[PDB]
Ligand binder design. Structure first.
Ligand SMILES: [Cu+2]
Ligand SMILES: [Cu+2]
Ligand code: NA
Ligand code: NA
Lengths: 620, 620
């Protein structure tokens, strides 16, 4: 019955059917994006209308369409031709990824470049990379991918060990033409292999790890109903999945006594970008919007038991559309389990004689995706004490280059002749807040130091201040770790028993934001990434901090355009957009396969509850 | 055989015997501190000399002594009378904690204060609190504790719910006299109870938690030999214990191929302070040095199985001295176990067809201590990938006050009439570095932004810079989260296969440091807490950032005096002292018992290894 249920195979084949019947999905058409729309505000009263949004590409060069379909009613709600030079190209299609290599393999300029380096074309892999927007006027309105080359010595070789520097090509994937081949000069192709399953490199595998067995003999403490509704230790939510955003949480609420108290209406990673900091023209255009350009959901791994996810695991297998509108299941694409999280609370009291210890736990909802060389785990955590956390785990193989003779200010050395260009991985979490309902506001809280003097004669006092962000023009905020800056989302109309507005405090990690010059193409396309915290007034069409169409799309859309509306956010339906990232100067230890590194954020109750919400947790 | 073995009961009784035989431990003497000394530098060549350091208090008012004993040789190495007005009072004795309440109970000023509030003296608990150094000239050279009152309605009541504000007393615990009773006026004593095991407050306990069972059917992957030598997954260390510092790690090294490579010679929490930010004269003197004044090791909890520590646990039961020099075991005072830590590394490669996943693990070494209302867990973690981490878990019951009518800039409200003064918990980790041996140096690393222009035409470049800290005068550093500031400890004489000095990078959390005015008593006594990172040249007598005697000791000793020596730290035997803390504005959710909050730091290999050190970890 839930309007937040996952898309079923049936619904996708029905969208396919409706589009076909309507003349919108002939044999030259391809689905570049398809997802279910969230129900409108206040729609609980009305009967279900399951609506799907679809971006349709045309392989014959006709203009693509944005289409909204009602699968409940079997109708097309709206269909509009896109002008991609204006609003952006559609997301990269899975089927286009082979096309860069295939076209380049019979291009005389490419072949000349490979022959200058004595490289067998049959062994040269070409990464199909998003193009961005730079100085090339001919690319505007065209679907372009850029290709960087990596040699693969044999079928099972890791090509990433053998970058071909000094060489880049640009390809029109629709007309199937190579527009440019740039050769700046030969660099040595690093020779050492990076095959992390080859016994010659690993040495003898360790025999010293004894098993760890995690079991739940009575099964898990959470329930799943309606396919994707979770109830666990007072928490209630719906686990959604979208091909762009991946796992999306809906209706996060906490049962406090008899009352189901909303906290967050929708939580997602609404964008992620990987900007590169190497000024070589071979890579200075590289910025991968894994979410917006590639669609991280669509590359979600099938997660194997006792391996990717350990313990008593419950899986969801979300269904997505292939390029023709046929349903495709991602088997075991979402893991759900609970795990012990050490001590929750502890006190041994001298005066009472009472010793008290209680254990913490968290609910984990995750998926893992692979985008070329990169693999990312996305983890959401709900804790007994009302804390909500996100963590991204970054691993895979580092993107490589040659290491220049005489070194580099922008590239580190991994192996002899092998470089790793500096880069960042920067996420935007979109938190459609609903602290005890939709009437919310945000305050910025700083620690306040006090001067020794009258009222503070020992010079020990310290305090804090809160500033309400009243309108969107005042709601673009930066971190200040030194002053302990956080942001509190409260409901000014819902008060706890001490007559204070209930709230939640967002604790950031205060990692560096986007480093690029503010006049760069990336600073404009990823404007969101230049500031730690944005607050907008909710609107149904403000979904992504980069807009709907990121691929080859200049600035114009996304957060900077949303906030220009300068709308009231003081006790209104609001959305918090938190930027957070990792700044990576690759180390030798990252090669040949990267150990996980992490980044994230959390929100903790701040006068939301009338006392600790975990007094009723049992011993042992 | 190891000179780093834990103290045995035998050794302590022998210290007792040697002191007695030497005339230093008659019936008026009391041991305020006793611990084993680390072996001297280069002492591996010589035979063992187990030496113990002892601070001896005298209950008849004679001057205390600092004594060093050789238990191997049965001799007193040195004994010196302390002048406590100059160098500091000895640590608070366990036996003095009852004395504040007991003396106050027959003092006419105290009784008058309690009668003004209609409080039965038999129900008034008095916390025995360190005094610090303020404006009271009569306290210099005297052992003083200050008392704050809390009402306990019945034997099992939590007194913390019922603070008696407006009232403080000062007591000389040697002469057994009350020096001062200050009554600033009556405040309502908060009436609501805070009994977190009372069913009326907890409600019916949850029945929704199903078991989680963690077992190791082949036992743990680590070995313990010589009582306290750990070997686990290439790591090697000795787990020490000291009554002041608690758990201390020695000789942290990693077996890389056939070579045992030192990383850290000694790691400890060398101080921790809890400064309060309420300017009321009732509490404006409150700063608890839990390590330096109280000795956190001595209050280590006995940890119960499946409860404080879950899984397959190996315990150490360290032995300490009681006040008379008799050994006392802290049964199950140290937990050691390994645990799964999610994904270590993962890549699914399109070109090779190879899917690869490996799991992480960490070795955990911990203890938990209780100091009045506070309980802290100290956790050290060693990871497969060479990462070393510390985490402090703060819980217990918040220190309370009245909540003033009309509110407060320095106190939050927890319950009706019940306040919680703002405060910090600030730790100093002392890391006696030995990166591939003792010849080490520290660089401060910042991210460097670059301007769009020649050499960077797309404005995408970014870089980093490193500054060597060459002498102690340049080695007092602050955090800069915005520039991604870290500190690298390297060995300039030990190079990896890429000809770069091997190293480790310290990643701080960049939480606020000490907030107090720089002219305060606490800023001087806890000078270490005003800066994030200090580097000193190693000396055997520079143990604590606050000096040896913190109790009622002004500035004069500790880090600021150490660095004045302005010694060479550029390729020398050095010590890093990292300040890190929590700034706590208590929330309603912290009451009546606080859910755990955390703070910490970590160090990760930075070109230490020639490639990933976890290539030899097996699948599944
Ligand atoms: Cu990276
Ligand atoms: Cu606290
Ligand atoms: Na909202
Ligand atoms: Na050292």
């Amino acid at each position: 019955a839930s309007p937040f249920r996952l898309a079923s195979a049936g619904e996708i084949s029905e969208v396919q059917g409706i589009l076909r019947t309507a003349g919108l999905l002939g044999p030259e058409k391809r689905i570049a994006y398809l997802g279910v729309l969230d129900p409108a505000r206040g729609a609980g009263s009305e009967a279900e209308d399951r609506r799907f949004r679809v971006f349709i590409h045309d392989v014959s060069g006709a203009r693509p369409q944005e289409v909204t379909v009602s699968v409940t009613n079997g109708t097309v709600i709206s269909a509009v031709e896109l002008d991609t030079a204006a609003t952006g190209e559609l997301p990269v299609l899975e089927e286009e990824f082979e096309v860069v290599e295939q076209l380049l393999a019979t291009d005389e300029r490419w072949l000349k470049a490979l022959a200058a380096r004595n490289l067998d074309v049959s062994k040269v892999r070409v990464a199909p990379l998003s193009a961005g927007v730079f100085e090339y006027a001919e690319e505007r309105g065209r679907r372009i991918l850029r290709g960087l080359a990596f040699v693969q010595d044999f079928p099972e070789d890791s090509a990433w060990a053998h970058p071909v520097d000094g060489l880049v090509a640009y390809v029109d994937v629709v007309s199937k033409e190579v527009t440019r081949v740039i050769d700046t000069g030969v660099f040595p192709v690093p020779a050492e292999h990076g095959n992390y399953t080859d016994p010659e490199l690993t040495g003898p595998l360790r025999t010293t790890q004894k098993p760890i067995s995690i079991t739940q003999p009575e099964g898990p403490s959470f329930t799943v109903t309606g396919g994707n509704h979770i109830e666990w230790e007072k928490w209630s939510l719906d686990v959604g999945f979208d091909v762009r955003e991946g796992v999306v949480l809906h209706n996060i609420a906490f049962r406090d006594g008899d009352r189901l108290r909303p906290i967050i209406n929708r939580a997602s990673i609404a964008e992620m970008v990987v900007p590169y900091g190497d000024p070589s023209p071979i890579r200075s255009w590289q910025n991968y919007f894994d979410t917006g350009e590639y669609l991280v959901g669509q590359y979600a791994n099938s997660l194997e038991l006792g391996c990717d996810c350990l313990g008593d695991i419950t899986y969801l297998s979300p269904v997505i559309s292939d390029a023709f509108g046929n349903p495709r299941e991602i088997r075991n694409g979402i893991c759900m389990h609970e795990e012990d999280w050490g001590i929750l609370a502890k006190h041994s009291d001298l005066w009472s004689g009472i010793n008290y210890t209680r254990r913490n736990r968290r609910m984990v909802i995750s998926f893992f995706t692979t985008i070329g060389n990169y693999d990312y785990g996305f983890y959401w955590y709900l804790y007994l004490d009302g804390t909500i956390e996100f963590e991204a785990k970054a691993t895979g193989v580092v993107f490589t280059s040659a290491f220049p003779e005489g070194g580099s200010d922008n590239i580190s050395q991994l192996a002899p002749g092998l470089g790793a260009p500096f880069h960042q991985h920067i996420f935007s979490a979109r938190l459609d807040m609903a602290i005890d309902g939709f009437t919310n506001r945000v305050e910025e809280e700083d620690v306040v130091r006090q001067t020794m003097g009258p009222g503070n004669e020992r010079g020990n006092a310290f305090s804090r201040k809160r500033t309400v962000l009243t309108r969107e023009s005042e709601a673009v905020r930066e971190a200040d770790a030194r002053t302990g800056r956080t942001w509190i989302i409260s409901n000014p109309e819902s008060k706890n028993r001490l007559n204070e507005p209930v709230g939640y405090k967002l604790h950031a990690h205060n990692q560096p934001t986007l480093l690029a010059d503010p006049g760069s193409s990336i600073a404009r396309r990823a404007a969101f990434a230049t500031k730690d915290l944005w607050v907008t007034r909710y609107a149904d069409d403000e979904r992504y901090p980069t807009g709907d169409f990121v691929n080859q799309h200049s600035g114009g859309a996304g957060l900077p355009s949303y906030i220009a509306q300068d709308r009231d956010i003081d006790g209104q339906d609001i959305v918090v957009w938190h930027t957070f990232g990792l700044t990576h100067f690759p180390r030798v230890e990252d090669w040949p396969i990267m150990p996980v590194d992490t980044v994230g954020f959390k929100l903790r109750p701040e006068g939301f509850f009338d006392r600790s919400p975990v007094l009723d947790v049992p011993a042992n």
